[PDB]
Design a protein around this ligand. Structure first.
Ligand SMILES: [Cl-]
Length: 211
């Protein structure tokens, strides 16, 4: 007996799209791209209020000794961001049952372009620029719930970074962690409800959500 949530909120740039590959190509090396994207995630975590996405990506690059122009290579290769295997299949399988929303730490300009790569008519796309704060601040997630008119207990969150676990816990969003590259959980972060290296197990998890 199906028990779908009323909505599913998604992290975009780690849970649905393979940003790691594009950031590594822009960096010139897998090691530089790893340091760069790890520093970027820590900067958004400690930012709180929105500072331009482009400025934080550029600051993360300088902080780890990448050339500052790596940010400009990443913007030039933005259309190369590929959906993970199973991402488009998951979203299409949820469409008749749940409202679908993106909650992304990105500018409105690049966030909307990346959201469009999944070929889905998203009900809501919330960027940190529109929300005025970066996740894990509660505002971006709460803005997606307030736009849909739903309480958090009727919605699920699909995360790609363990930093989202701080925010989903605070808002009351039960979370499935699509942890493809096997990141560790940040210190002090609560465990996800479900966690897997692929997106396929998210569909049975969401189908049994209210059961
Ligand atoms: Cl690190």
């Amino acid at each position: 007996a199906a028990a779908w949530p009323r909505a599913v909120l998604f992290d975009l740039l780690t849970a649905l799209l393979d940003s790691w590959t594009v950031w590594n190509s822009a960096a010139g090396s897998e090691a530089a791209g790893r340091d760069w994207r790890a520093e970027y995630l820590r900067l958004t975590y400690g930012c709180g209020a929105y500072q331009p996405y482009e400025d934080l990506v550029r600051e993360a690059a300088r902080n780890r000794g990448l050339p500052a122009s790596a940010a400009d290579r990443l913007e030039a290769q933005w259309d190369q961001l590929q959906p993970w295997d199973g991402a488009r299949e998951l979203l299409a399988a949820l469409r008749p049952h749940c409202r679908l929303a993106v909650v992304t730490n990105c500018s409105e300009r690049l966030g909307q372009r990346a959201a469009a790569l999944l070929g889905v008519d998203w009900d809501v796309v919330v960027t940190s620029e529109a929300a005025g704060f970066y996740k894990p601040d509660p505002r971006p997630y709460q803005l997606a719930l307030d736009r849909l008119g739903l309480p958090a207990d009727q919605a699920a969150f699909v995360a790609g970074s363990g930093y989202d676990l701080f925010g989903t816990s605070a808002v009351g969003l039960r979370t499935f962690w699509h942890n493809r590259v096997g990141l560790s959980r940040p210190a002090g972060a609560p465990a996800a409800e479900g966690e897997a290296a692929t997106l396929a197990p998210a569909l049975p998890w969401l189908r049994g959500f209210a059961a």
